[PDB]
Amino acid sequence: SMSVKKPKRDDSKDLALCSMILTEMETHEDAWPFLLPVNLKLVPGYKKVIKKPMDFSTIREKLSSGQYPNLETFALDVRLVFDNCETFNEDDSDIGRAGHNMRKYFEKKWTDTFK
16 A cells, blocks of 8 residues: 555566467467467358457467556456467367367466466
8 A cells, every 4th residue: 555565576578478479379270270360251150259360370469568457457468369269169179179279378377487
Protein backbone atom coordinates (compact mmCIF):
# COMPACT_ATOMS: atom_id res chain seq x y z
CA SER A 1 0.00 0.00 0.00
CA MET A 2 1.14 3.62 0.23
CA SER A 3 4.87 3.67 0.95
CA VAL A 4 4.82 -0.16 1.71
CA LYS A 5 6.21 -2.10 -1.26
CA LYS A 6 6.73 -5.84 -1.94
CA PRO A 7 10.33 -6.81 -3.01
CA LYS A 8 11.42 -6.01 -6.64
CA ARG A 9 11.14 -9.06 -9.06
CA ASP A 10 13.78 -8.44 -11.82
CA ASP A 11 11.82 -8.00 -15.10
CA SER A 12 14.64 -6.55 -17.20
CA LYS A 13 15.11 -9.73 -19.29
CA ASP A 14 11.35 -10.37 -19.78
CA LEU A 15 11.25 -8.72 -23.26
CA ALA A 16 14.14 -10.77 -24.57
CA LEU A 17 12.85 -13.95 -23.03
CA CYS A 18 9.28 -13.52 -24.49
CA SER A 19 10.98 -12.80 -27.89
CA MET A 20 12.86 -16.10 -27.58
CA ILE A 21 9.79 -18.04 -26.67
CA LEU A 22 7.88 -16.48 -29.58
CA THR A 23 10.75 -17.45 -31.98
CA GLU A 24 10.49 -20.98 -30.83
CA MET A 25 6.70 -20.97 -31.38
CA GLU A 26 7.09 -19.34 -34.84
CA THR A 27 9.55 -22.07 -35.91
CA HIS A 28 7.53 -25.07 -34.61
CA GLU A 29 6.25 -27.21 -37.51
CA ASP A 30 2.73 -27.03 -36.15
CA ALA A 31 2.70 -23.19 -36.05
CA TRP A 32 1.33 -22.90 -39.65
CA PRO A 33 -2.32 -22.28 -38.70
CA PHE A 34 -1.23 -19.40 -36.40
CA LEU A 35 1.49 -17.52 -38.25
CA LEU A 36 -0.80 -14.93 -39.90
CA PRO A 37 -4.21 -13.47 -39.22
CA VAL A 38 -7.20 -15.47 -40.43
CA ASN A 39 -8.46 -13.91 -43.65
CA LEU A 40 -11.86 -12.67 -42.57
CA LYS A 41 -13.03 -12.28 -46.22
CA LEU A 42 -12.36 -15.95 -47.01
CA VAL A 43 -13.29 -17.82 -43.85
CA PRO A 44 -17.05 -17.98 -43.23
CA GLY A 45 -18.14 -17.45 -39.70
CA TYR A 46 -14.75 -16.29 -38.32
CA LYS A 47 -15.46 -12.66 -38.07
CA LYS A 48 -18.77 -13.00 -36.21
CA VAL A 49 -17.78 -15.86 -33.96
CA ILE A 50 -14.22 -14.84 -32.91
CA LYS A 51 -14.51 -11.54 -31.17
CA LYS A 52 -10.75 -11.03 -30.60
CA PRO A 53 -8.69 -12.60 -33.38
CA MET A 54 -5.01 -13.12 -32.59
CA ASP A 55 -2.04 -14.62 -34.39
CA PHE A 56 1.75 -14.89 -33.96
CA SER A 57 2.63 -12.10 -36.47
CA THR A 58 0.38 -9.71 -34.57
CA ILE A 59 1.94 -10.73 -31.26
CA ARG A 60 5.41 -10.26 -32.80
CA GLU A 61 4.52 -6.72 -33.99
CA LYS A 62 2.98 -5.84 -30.59
CA LEU A 63 6.06 -7.15 -28.81
CA SER A 64 8.42 -5.23 -31.15
CA SER A 65 6.56 -1.89 -30.63
CA GLY A 66 6.11 -1.78 -26.83
CA GLN A 67 2.50 -2.77 -26.82
CA TYR A 68 2.84 -5.32 -23.98
CA PRO A 69 3.08 -3.67 -20.59
CA ASN A 70 4.20 -6.85 -18.86
CA LEU A 71 4.74 -10.57 -19.40
CA GLU A 72 1.15 -11.48 -18.29
CA THR A 73 -0.42 -9.44 -21.16
CA PHE A 74 1.92 -11.24 -23.57
CA ALA A 75 0.79 -14.63 -22.21
CA LEU A 76 -2.87 -13.55 -22.49
CA ASP A 77 -2.49 -12.94 -26.24
CA VAL A 78 -0.64 -16.22 -26.82
CA ARG A 79 -3.41 -18.14 -24.94
CA LEU A 80 -6.05 -16.21 -26.94
CA VAL A 81 -4.52 -17.73 -30.10
CA PHE A 82 -5.20 -21.23 -28.75
CA ASP A 83 -8.53 -20.37 -27.21
CA ASN A 84 -9.75 -19.07 -30.54
CA CYS A 85 -8.47 -22.18 -32.27
CA GLU A 86 -10.44 -24.41 -29.83
CA THR A 87 -13.57 -22.25 -30.35
CA PHE A 88 -13.55 -22.67 -34.10
CA ASN A 89 -11.96 -26.05 -34.79
CA GLU A 90 -12.80 -29.61 -33.85
CA ASP A 91 -10.23 -31.28 -31.52
CA ASP A 92 -9.84 -34.13 -34.09
CA SER A 93 -8.90 -31.90 -37.06
CA ASP A 94 -5.38 -31.10 -38.11
CA ILE A 95 -5.76 -27.46 -36.98
CA GLY A 96 -7.44 -28.42 -33.74
CA ARG A 97 -4.64 -30.90 -32.87
CA ALA A 98 -2.02 -28.28 -33.94
CA GLY A 99 -3.53 -25.84 -31.43
CA HIS A 100 -3.45 -28.32 -28.57
CA ASN A 101 0.15 -29.20 -29.36
CA MET A 102 1.23 -25.55 -29.51
CA ARG A 103 -0.54 -24.65 -26.26
CA LYS A 104 1.30 -27.53 -24.53
CA TYR A 105 4.59 -26.42 -26.10
CA PHE A 106 4.05 -22.84 -25.00
CA GLU A 107 3.02 -23.63 -21.41
CA LYS A 108 6.10 -25.79 -20.91
CA LYS A 109 8.47 -23.09 -22.24
CA TRP A 110 6.62 -20.50 -20.04
CA THR A 111 7.00 -22.60 -16.84
CA ASP A 112 10.56 -23.48 -17.58
CA THR A 113 11.55 -19.88 -18.31
CA PHE A 114 9.76 -17.88 -15.56
CA LYS A 115 8.38 -20.26 -12.83
